[model samples]
Target: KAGCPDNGMSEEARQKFLEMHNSLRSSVALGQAKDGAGGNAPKAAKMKTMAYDCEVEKTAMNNAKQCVFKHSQPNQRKGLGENIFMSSDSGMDKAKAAEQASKAWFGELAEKGVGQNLKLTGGLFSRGVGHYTQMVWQETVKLGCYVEACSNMCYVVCQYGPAGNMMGKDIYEKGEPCSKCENCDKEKGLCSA
Candidate 1:
């Protein structure tokens, strides 16, 4: 006798799944594009500063993360440094590039779906946690060797950490070598050697 086949998800569940799938696909594509472009972009020689503020809320917890990104031309500025100012109430932490991108995208998705009040709480469940990030960038673009200054703000929200008991570390720490989190490695598609 053949065993009973698995029943499909409910209509609502299926729809929500599809929506999330499409959104994730779009986010991955955008991330790839941004990474590629950032890699190919030329470095600046003069120091420039970009600053912005971000707010993240989940359940009854409200947090704000803020930072300033500094871009500079080599050999032009003294003591060139970039500083990030995080709110004391906000559990701000340093994040990896991918983590930062993910947070920004999550924020974008939530803002698109249910305004900015609803916090995202789904991903790897017990193994991973979600976070949000926002950044403002400023640069001088070269148009046929003619430079023009430009600025823009970026926002993202995404999940991080590993499954089970090791899921509370910061994203940046999660990506470091010797880290032992199967969930985090799986989520990031990174291999353990």
Candidate 2:
């Protein structure tokens, strides 16, 4: 009580929270809701066992995946997608294949619960990877639909699609942060912590 009161948190852990939280702000602020999920799909502090709460993350991902498949349908037809970036020869018929993939993953998510998905619990914990743990929700998703209006692009697909679904860190802004946010690249001194 005299010296630094123990919030019981670490510097590294705080930084991690700040990092996940920053982009999370962007997603929530710059994004919109789709299906039954929140708008901003963001980053992770660490991975852990899944639980009931993880449904939010999984649902968000499914929606984002739907958009990705919707937007990239044509590209996949030509095999320009990340999955087939170099390999192209009629493999892609049409669509991002997000439909089938979404169904599969969502079903997997529901069936497996958070234990198998390796959840991105936001903060540090002394223990409890299973039912006995606490999580900070370091990663989350929000829908960004700027590209939805224009057929050519809103940049949300490439930006939020897979990365948000999987809680991938952009470090690159996915392109054009527009001065509203930093990619939060650690080495670039952009660490929000």
Candidate 3:
């Protein structure tokens, strides 16, 4: 029986295999396996779900908020006009002065709620307000990590790893190995991966 080469193992080999199997069973019972059921897998899975939900919430909040202009019309327009006047004193200066006066008048109109009339000029106030809102929303979302959800909502997601390294690398060198790869040239290439 110990010389059974056709069976590919003797009684001694069979006993060794049995011992190895028993040892593996004991290690598994002791939680020595890499992914043993006694590990933190369940908790990690729950935390991942929570992080995804948080990210979606954060993105949604950013998209919903409106942007408000910090500087009033008088301050914004007058500052621009003064810069123009100081840069040039010819027709440009006269034009800037007139523009400043008109802005001052419009500031008063805005204060008195008569600025709504300017809306008839088509997109005068609406464009500014929309741009401001969009800018504010973009800036606000930069503060948090998020995941996009359906219906234009975002969930606040937990951050993973470092935020800075998420952008990948530049990988552009003048004569490097990947330089001649597809879309690597400036003039006629789709450069983006």
Candidate 4:
């Protein structure tokens, strides 16, 4: 209707498209992003180890996701490296360039089994200082014609250079947000706070 192409697609194609989209999302979210820990569970604590792994990984991933949401610009999509697209700094570029690279990377995601029934919207943009953006992938199907579906979104968080001065430090995995607190115990584990 509104989003579909002029010809529209069949229900069969829509179903197949969703199936493919869900599978692709599951792989990226569960195994790839911050969520996955190279097949092992997530490692938490300043100790940098895994206790309750999966949830921890999800939390870390979600934490990073929220960080992206807070820090990122909106409505910009940049694609790079294999099947991954990105949300980037606002002034980075404009839509034409975004869609160009978006289509290129999306083509790759499709080759990886994401299905050919898809399109790319304008996408989201991140904020200024953080140099972040929301990556949006729109899935569509060509049942009879090109019918546009919904958009899938994720934040691509980046790692800046690290400061080596901290050394081997002890911090809480689930303690207060920061380490300089009363409840965060270094040795005994968990926040006594």
Best-matching candidate per TM-score = 4
* Ordering by TM-score: 4, 2, 1, 3
* Model 2 alpha-carbon miss at residue 174, Å: 29
> Distance from true position, residue 2, model 3, in Å?
10
Q: Write the per-residue lDDT of candidate 4 for residues 1-193, one digit (tens) a residue.
A: 1233222233343333233333332233222322111231112222111111122122223333342343222222111101123444432232322343334332433233321111211211111101111111111111111112213333322211111112122111222221433443344222223
Question: What would the per-residue lDDT of candidate 2 be over residues 1-193, giving only the tens digit for each residue?
Answer: 0121222222332233224333333332232202122222223322211111222222322333343334344333221111111112223221222222223322322233333122334321112121111111222221111112123221112112222222222222322223333444322212232
Give per-model CA RMSD.
21.0, 19.4, 32.7, 18.4
Off by over 4 Å in 3: 1-8, 36-193
Worst 10 residues of 3 by lDDT: 41-50
**Tens digits of lDDT, candidate 1, 1-193:** 0121122112232223223322343332222212321231111112111111111011001111122223233232222212112222222222322233334434432433212111222332221222211111112110000011113222112111111112332112112321332322222322222
lDDT of each model, Cα atoms only? 0.22, 0.25, 0.22, 0.24
lDDT of 2 at 89: 22
Tens-digit lDDT track of model 3 for 69-185:
122233222211110101122222222333332233223222332121212223423333221111111111111221223232221111111111111221111222223444232
**TM-score, cand. 4:** 0.21
What TM-score would each prediction reach against the true structure?
A: 0.18, 0.20, 0.16, 0.21
